[PDB]
């Protein structure tokens, strides 16, 4: 670590702001160095090639860098980790926040959003139909398991196949192969209301201590008066959510649902949504998170709660609806699945061989990935059917499709108090040109909004891509990060290497199917930044390797600061946070004795 | 007058021949005091 710091810190003078590109590329380098140890000969150094190509491109991107540095610096970065154990290589994920953070800007942040939120996409109708069929099948199977095999209230169409009608009458399960096969019987399906919308699941979601964007009439009140040429409107309306909630003369949860059902959201003339730069992200340009007005924020949080509480539990691949123990156990089982558990015409002559429990065992090969700008690639066509299905389930209409119809005719601005506009007088928001930090008429989604529906659609797409060729997979998906273990039955008389080489063929054959499915749904599975492994997969920024979790001990030690997370300077809270940080470091792979002494 | 009612309820719960400070805590959590505390706990910083 000391050598790594010494090597990288030399780049800051010569390479001013591009150093954070290398600092971000550090983690893919660790993943590649771990990947170069797997048994399969094709997967050795397959991601390291792309990582090194990216580093060479970075190091040959300027005249100062060319005449002061060279591509030989990649060798210096690499040589400090060659011939080292797995734990030492995997430990450098704790070196993420120890290099500082880059200086952000509003125009640079909005340029990428404009670039990747204005493009027109081509979608396949059949693929969406099959994904919807898998969606309905998973819901039906979940309700069956929950209520002991009884189907939920369903009204099949007239053109339903005899197999589906027989399954409904007999109250039997449906496999995804049947769902893809008889996918035309799910086209006109129509659920009935069996879940009652509860508006009092959590009373504290309407009073979160957050900030709200001002109404569109006075949008520039975010910038302080010290940075604006003119003077803002004298109307004194609070932008924080707490005071707005306190000063609400009329309020009942029914009105939020009535607002989102009765068509009011599209007729509101005072709706404003504004981005805000994200802190402590060391990408060369920081991330963005959006905030809306009061009513729309309440509607959004209600929709998220409704979708997550009830429908989310029907899927077994959601990581956001499982407790600590259940999620840990499932992840450990999936990781262990990656290692074999047993090393070793006349007068037809047959010899009795001592078969060992059918002589076939299941082994899996792992594929972990994240999509390119997951939130920006969605469209209304992709999610309209699933929103309608959820509406039918809940007995209401057009609540879960509130995002795109509202956003398609709105303007977004990156609101930073120290990046004011150059206006001399107040100007209506929709009058500024399509440049600077304005996004006009967006199409895609927003980071952190209706993410549960996107997760369900992604799970359905993964299952369709698996069924499309015949392989079997088990997945774990949260937002963008998805880890899929492709399982295959192989003879148990073989050896380790041959079994792994057998499963690698299924993985490389399923990767193209997943790419085609995601391209059909409008997304794009980037070809060179997908982690195919035989032992490891990454989830929640942690690596699972042959059933064991590689340690990250120094990350919980780097946050043992004196005045740590204290509202006011007090000894009790600081000592509590120190003890918590040291306990976390101990349970991440630090020695208990030295951890206690250092604490 | 919520404070007087809360103290009187807690005293009625615990002032017995055997004191069970966990059952009474659960009962108070399920009562009005639980939602009162949940709502009032939204402000956690001195600045706010």
């Amino acid at each position: 670590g000391n050598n790594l710091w010494e090597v990288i810190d030399k780049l800051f003078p010569i390479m001013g702001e591009k150093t954070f590109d290398v600092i971000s590329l550090l983690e893919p380098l660790a993943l590649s160095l771990i990947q170069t140890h797997d048994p399969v000969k094709q997967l050795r150094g397959a991601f390291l090639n792309h990582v090194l190509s990216e580093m060479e491109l970075i190091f040959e991107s300027g005249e100062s860098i060319r005449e002061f540095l060279s591509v030989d610096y990649i060798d210096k970065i690499l040589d400090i980790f060659n011939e080292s154990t797995i734990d030492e290589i995997a430990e450098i994920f704790s070196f993420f926040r120890t290099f500082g953070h880059p200086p952000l800007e509003a125009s640079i942040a909005a340029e990428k959003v404009r670039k990747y939120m204005y493009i027109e996409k081509q979608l396949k109708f059949d693929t969406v139909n099959k994904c919807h069929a898998i969606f309905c099948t998973i819901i039906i199977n979940g309700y069956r398991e929950r209520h002991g095999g009884q189907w939920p209230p369903v009204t099949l169409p007239d053109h339903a196949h005899e197999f589906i009608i027989n399954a409904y009458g007999s109250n039997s399960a449906i496999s995804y192969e049947n769902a893809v096969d008889y996918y035309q019987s799910f086209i006109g399906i129509k659920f009935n209301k069996f879940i009652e919308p509860q508006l009092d699941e959590d009373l504290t979601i309407y009073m979160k201590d957050k900030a709200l964007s001002p109404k569109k009439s006075n949008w520039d009140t975010v910038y302080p008066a010290s940075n604006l040429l003119y003077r803002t409107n004298a109307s004194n309306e609070s932008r924080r959510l707490v005071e707005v909630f306190i000063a609400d003369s009329k309020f009942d949860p029914h009105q939020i649902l009535d607002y989102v059902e009765s068509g009011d959201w599209l007729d509101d003339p005072e709706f404003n949504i504004s981005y805000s730069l994200k802190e402590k992200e060391i990408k060369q340009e920081g991330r963005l998170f959006a905030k809306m007005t009061y009513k729309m924020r309440a509607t959004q949080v209600l929709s998220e709660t409704l979708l997550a509480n009830n429908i989310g539990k029907f899927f077994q691949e959601n990581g956001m609806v499982k407790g600590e123990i259940e999620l840990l156990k499932r992840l450990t089982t999936i990781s262990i699945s990656g290692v074999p558990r047993y090393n070793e015409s006349k007068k037809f002559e047959f010899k009795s061989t001592d078969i060992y429990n059918d002589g076939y065992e299941t082994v899996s090969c792992f594929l972990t990935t994240d999509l390119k700008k997951y939130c920006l690639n969605w469209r209304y066509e992709s999610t309209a059917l699933f929103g309608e299905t959820c509406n039918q389930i809940f007995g209401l209409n057009k609540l879960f499709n509130w995002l795109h119809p509202r956003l398609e005719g709105s303007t977004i601005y990156v609101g930073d108090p120290y990046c004011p506009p150059s206006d001399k007088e107040h100007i209506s928001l929709e009058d500024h040109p399509d440049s600077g930090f304005y996004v006009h008429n967006p199409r895609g989604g927003i980071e952190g909004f209706c993410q549960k529906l996107w997760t369900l659609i992604s799970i359905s797409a993964i299952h369709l891509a698996a069924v499309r060729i015949g392989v079997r997979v088990t997945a774990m998906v949260q937002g963008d990060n998805q880890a899929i273990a492709v399982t295959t039955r192989v003879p148990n008389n073989y050896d380790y290497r041959i079994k792994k080489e057998i499963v690698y063929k299924d993985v490389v054959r399923f990767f193209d199917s997943l790419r085609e499915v995601m391209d059909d749904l409008g997304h794009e599975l980037k070809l060179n930044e997908t982690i195919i492994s035989s032992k490891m997969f990454i989830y929640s920024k942690r690596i699972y390797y042959d059933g064991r979790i590689l340690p990250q001990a120094l990350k919980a030690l780097s946050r043992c600061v004196f005045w740590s997370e204290t509202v006011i300077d007090e000894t009790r809270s600081a000592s509590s946070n120190l003890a918590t940080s040291f306990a976390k470091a101990i349970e991440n792979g630090y020695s208990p004795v030295l951890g206690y002494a250092c604490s | 007058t919520m404070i007087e009612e809360d103290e009187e309820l807690a005293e009625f719960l615990m002032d017995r021949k055997v004191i069970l400070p966990r059952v009474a805590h659960d009962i108070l959590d399920n009562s009005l005091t639980g939602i009162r505390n949940a709502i009032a706990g939204m402000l956690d910083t001195t600045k706010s």
Partner: peptide, 15 residues
Amino acid sequence: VSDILYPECHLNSPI
């Protein structure tokens, strides 16, 4: 007097 306001001790804002 409201003298319970302390300056922030850790980074919590973008640069």
